[model samples]
Target: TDKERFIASLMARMSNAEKIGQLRLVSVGADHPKEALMADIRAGKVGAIFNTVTRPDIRAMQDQVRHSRLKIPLFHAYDVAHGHRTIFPISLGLAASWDPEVVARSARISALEASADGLDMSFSPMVDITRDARWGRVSEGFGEDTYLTSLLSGVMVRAYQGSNLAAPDSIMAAVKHFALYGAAEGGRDYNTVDMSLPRMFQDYLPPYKAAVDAGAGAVMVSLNTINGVPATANRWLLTDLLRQQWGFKGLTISDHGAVKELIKHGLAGNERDATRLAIQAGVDMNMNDDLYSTWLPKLLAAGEIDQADIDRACRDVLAAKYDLGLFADPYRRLGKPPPFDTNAESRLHRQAAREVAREGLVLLKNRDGLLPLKKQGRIAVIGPLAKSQRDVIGSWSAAGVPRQAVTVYQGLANAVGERATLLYAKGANVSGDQAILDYLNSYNPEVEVDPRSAEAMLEEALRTARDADLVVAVVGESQGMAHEASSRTDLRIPASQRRLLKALKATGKPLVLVLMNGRPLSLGWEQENADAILETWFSGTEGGNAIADVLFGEHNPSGKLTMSFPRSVGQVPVYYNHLNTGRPMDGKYTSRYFDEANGPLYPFGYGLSYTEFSLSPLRLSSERLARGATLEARVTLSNSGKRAGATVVQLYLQDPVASLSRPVKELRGFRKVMLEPGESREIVFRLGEADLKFYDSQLRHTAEPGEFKVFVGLDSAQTESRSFTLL
Candidate 1:
């Protein structure tokens, strides 16, 4: 009734065509003139704008909106995918850290920076549950697991929206690519999605549902067709299930041109049919598609679509503007001068990012005493990423200024100071040919350069390697290699980079490979040839210093793998925290692959620190306790090495027998401790019933009574364990 009155008032003054135009949203081209944008706004032909930010620009447009026939406020949105101004790691990279607090803080920082820039909303915290590694959009989501992704989705929403939605600086967080965008077939963009109800409810819906439960302001329809129905025109997906069943009160916007593309999707004959389908399906706004504007009025006049439906959709869009406090003072958050130093931050936040980045960098392989490189050495840093500052920061780093980032070259130089001699070479380009170079350059405009000839680069790297006592080859994909439409057919170091490594290794030097990349790469060759391998995933601003600290024994590598490292791309959709299959493969002989390795190249929670620490036999204060009573499991860790180092003692839980099948291991708690040589301390983890709960088929999270395995160790693959009961 309240929404009806709001819609009636708006409909009273406008021609049917203008009312429909208000529902049609459009992307403002980066080069589009301000006057061009204002003409559309003042005529009441625009309701929402995307890809347009900057305080003055947003304020100027808002001014035009206020002068329009309806005097409606415009909602300005952008792809605040990661961090707004202070770029943090990508969603997938952050997900790999398995630290919710850090993820939340990253979102909080994004909201702060975005609000300061005068933006009203961000299309972020993409909660799509992706199991297909081939899907390029996977970088925007948390990996395969439903529960972990859902938990993180809730965390991100809370961080973005905070406790209050009405705050001036608090921008609305739109949980996007809704309802199975991650299940795209063939891992291709805008592909079809097919899944059963059980699969949808159990695996895909949790994260979006979590966002909805957390009071997310809006949802964006995905580009994919779900079970032969395009999501933009699927009433069961948008209205019946999302609104009626889930009780989501937020507005739903289509993905860029999704309604217009309904013809391509075979759901409609033309734009008019697409418009009718989308409106009837409950899409509140059309994004960058003129279908709503061009056809809705004609359709309504012909009695094909109701005016009430148009009004209803428009009302929701208007309410979103009202909810954003845009109606009170349209230019309230706008008109501040551009920040000269927009990347300013508290020491605490930067330290938090550094710590989380450290925890996310998985140490794949380290042979007998090869790592924690001795301070005194003639170190040859070879490869493209070694000296390159641009590649270390990875993709989706919109706010990351290259000048502020640290390269492996910079890190090593700082780590050794004058004690260790440093030699360098531009070993090889990240990719082999110009084609791949073009792909990488699409994301990083400056990475394109006159690459040294392969033979020449390899010869130079080998010469440098032969002269040094130790060689550190920092090699991997450059920036823009992993985020947004960056899905790879084969996840590996480029053939050229691999050949460069092979040539460098022929020098018979002590090679330490520091792998920098956005996603987990297949390092089968490096695993066999390299003495030590450190997976330093595009650490931001402090990347160089962090790498230096880890390499020169100043800071020990304590990061663990959040996602599994596959032996080959064929083994993707691979992860450690998977439900035990009915007929699981046995390492010995049952259901094993003859051509491929049986296990992951590297398991989840897999990482190695410099110093060796023994996990004492797991000791629990009590075997049985009440549901609310907290119990402690302690393990004594001793640094056996001669040098001081840090170790991440991880705690995992296992349900031996349950009503539903469970993963063999689930990370419950962990503690990162720094210890000197011969130092020993008890690392304790407090366990509770809440940590053991799982979402049932009915969508209730509950813990069942069962025998549980408590594991403590450096990583999931290598852990010591004890047994307990949840009674």
Candidate 2:
């Protein structure tokens, strides 16, 4: 009742023009004059300001509102994706950990640091479930699995909002790219997404709904088109599904300049039409454009849109502010007194980053037991990314200082100290292709080309490798290569690095590959040639220390692959949980690629440790599961190796002969357990109707009464199995 009265009174005092302004979310840039923007803020012509941080600037903007007809405070926001100042591992890397508490801790610290910078909101916890590794933004989201992404989505929201969003340290979490933005065609960014309704519900929609169900305060619409309609203009998506079906009563904002781009998508003839479509589609805020501000009033005057549309959008914006405690104290975040120290780094936060990054490192391949390198040997660190501080933190590092980031060189040097002699060499440029180099350097010089020729660098690197006992070659995408609008057609290691790796392989020294990439790269050659391969997907600020820790055996590498690494780019959409074809892959006259392999190079949940582990035969509590009774799937996990290690015991379920065809096996439950050497423990996963449920052909979520297969083990492909009937 109190909330209703406050919003109702605020809406009553807002004029039509002011109401329209409430829907405008503008960017602070050099393209516009600061004084002019401030004047607009004072005149009640602006609702929220994004891309602007710092307590002083936000407070100044909030002060302008006091002079307006109604002193509605302005809320400040930023793209606080991974971390605010103290950067952690990228989203995909966090998923590699398979630990929700790790994700939550990173998010919680992000909220504290971001709110300290006076940002009232964050566009984060990107929950897009993407299978295609060719998509560059795969780094920005969790992996392909719906269950894992859905689980983390809620964990991130709870961490960001805490028990109360009104807490001074808490920042409002904005679950982004609302619907199926990850399923972009050709693995391209902002491309059209064509998907069946059942596929949408069963695979993609659950993660977004999970975030909404977690009580996310806001939703950011995507730039991609869902079916035929752009997400920003799709009334059914934003209203019918998100609001009505899922009961998401949160403020909805567009992607940057997304409302204006509806014109490009051919949905709107002009800005006015775009504005009308966006407002009616349930978009409450227009990001980085004045389309809502300029065309909303005109659309209302022309009777193209109802007053209810403007009021509804305006109320959402106000309610969000009210929920943020802005109405009670406009300075809730801004009032906190602390200047962000760009020069001085936080040791405590950096330690947290190191711990999280350590857990995220996935030991992809460990051949001949070559890893956990001894500090006594002569170690040669080679590659363009060896000493790269900027790329280590990866992309979307909000306010992270590149110089402060620990590079692989710094990390190795710090680890070995005076015990081992370290040889350093730049094996090759990140990419030999001038086109790629120029494209990457066009915006920011993320990939720096050495002044020397590629041949010279290769020769120099070979000499250093020959002198060393073992070679630790760090290679992969520069930060820019695996970010927004940076999709790759070919998923192989760049030719430049491939040449260097081949040369290093010919040297016959123990070769260890430390991959620094965003998405899953086709590593067919690396798996065969390199003695060990460590997949570190653009680990964050303390990545250097974390990498060193894992390499020197201080920390056991436990992270599992969240996405499948393709053997070739041709198998683009390969995932472990995929439906079987009418004719399965049996070579002759079957669903097999004649030229390439049907399976991925490395399957999802595929990871290795220095020590060996094993899972006992799968056992079920009951052979027949009653409708309401629960079933227990049990397995005894043992660490048989001499060294202690942690691994994920994954439980997958297969519903055979259902109403509709289902994936061969879907991950239902997973538990990360640490066992000492020679120790064994029984892990049990409870199964019920909910665990067996799936979106049917008619889009109803129900489980069929039939036989179910249970698989339990380390990874998806390598598992022990048993059968039970769901009665």
Candidate 3:
């Protein structure tokens, strides 16, 4: 390969010290002094620069490399989590669309805008499958299901990298936080993860491999310990499984400061040992931490590590740059003149964000068909987030300016010209806990505490509710509440907002709860009391317009839940797919909770629509399946309601009998379809032996011959089943 030959020839001229330097990725902006960073770049002591997004900053840094003996281009990276400048819905919300194309579109736009800003790589497309909503970072991943997350993982990688990695608009994708970071014990960030090998292979490991299989150029090691071993120094995870078994040839990067923390994990005595173990365990680059550069040379001198080890890691870093076309043209996507038509650029990207944001909204509850609300009457909008520009964009919003975002109030105003009267009131603070407010504000002033007393705010909201025909309360967690290191013990609406909701309910007016959150909330009360509930999960830049579009019947809501919503936080790990117990919850002594319901308030793939849908009984092409043949499953779907809308049809498989106990139902296929007011469509899915395979007790991927049940329906819990025999 040309890339291999180029990197090999380039490495021949590099010194041992320079090879070690290529494994060091450091931060440059904000608290990282540029004077020292630039000096290191000139001395060939820096490999990559992060947090430097401006064209001038990156060009200046790349130019300094010319001073070194071998001028290797510096790779520029950033965290383009959801979107870059034009923000889209958070990854979790994007999953709700149940449309892989929607996610890919967002990734494409993200890569374009980010690469245009002097970025070559993005540390994104976080594919961790999380079941517990208490984990704040749950908002960053696809969802709890392995199949759905794995599907989106590949879609994101291909979209970010595009068809050619060397294309000026394409940015190399780093499939991130690898290997069971989401299974952190106690739903805490960076917590220890201990699980059987079977569980790892079955539930947690596929998404990372999916990204790698999609040609991701890099993999970021997680900060957590997997099976009592830190992933940063796990040879089996990085080498045995990822490189050897999966055949992933990309570079492997450590999470921020993860290599240095190996000392804290008790894997090493000091920085020297940490650096040695990291490279030996297959970590190609150390991110933000100077452990690799500061100690690798000394370790090689001390004979703890050899030059061959340094050469292997250096080759990976160089290979990535070559693939990104940095070797041929150092400024592939840099030094572009400012856009003459800035408004046209904004319209192009923001509209895409708006379209995707509309699809990500999940309508959880609608009693008496209360939604598609008439835009002609007096509408009272209440809650802390009703007019918030910042919270709507959510967390990890790279380079998004809050003021540019449209608020729910603004959206409503845009929807209703002179036809309706709009009234607004701040019903409550995001949280009454001062500690939470301080913590969130420390990152940025995400929440603004009104100077008025709590009682005064509630009283004002009550008055506003009485004056309006219906009250639409927009409320939920602050954006920071669902970001990194922001776990919550109770997943309920905050105390302050609950007080406002109760008062608004007493006003004898129709109530609509528009949720702006990152993760699914414990919405038992809201489900029962509110006339309508829209689960708008921190929709991005054009969120307000999207929510307004759905509320006023401009757009039909089609999004569904990726992660199940628990009745209470007690059901922390609640999900639809689980191995059946000997004594199931059949209203008897079994694996059930007495304090609350046994299941989630809302199951996975559950959502409501303005138009209703009905699925015919399962139809199969054959009752028996051969080893290498396919089984065609068909169902007729009809829109039975008055309005035209879209719905997601999910296909699940149950291995009733296998060598290992399988999940009661695993999602294997899904299709999103749109129909007219009264149209029927036949949905078809073909499954082969490969689809029925599972990791057995001995870790063999095989499909046992047995009777299998195929389930198809709108959601996981409500499905029609048919039986089949595989021989």
| Candidate 2: residue 525 lDDT (0-100) | 84
CA RMSD of each candidate after superposition: 4.0, 1.3, 1.4
Reference-based lDDT, each prediction: 0.77, 0.90, 0.91
Q: Which candidate is the best by lDDT?
A: 3
Residue pairs in clash, model 1: none
TM-scores of the models, in the order given: 0.87, 0.98, 0.98
Off by over 4 Å in 1: 1-22, 30-34, 335-356, 414-419, 441-446, 579-583, 587-589, 612-714, 719-727
RMSD of 3: 1.4
Q: TM-score for model 1? A: 0.87
- The list of candidate 2 runs beyond 4 A from truth reads 336-343
lDDT of 1 by residue, 298-385 (tens): 8888899887788778767877777777766777667432344444554124554555565455567888878778878788988888
Error of 3 at 563 (Å): 0.6
Clashes of 3: 0
Worst 10 residues of 1 by lDDT: 339-348
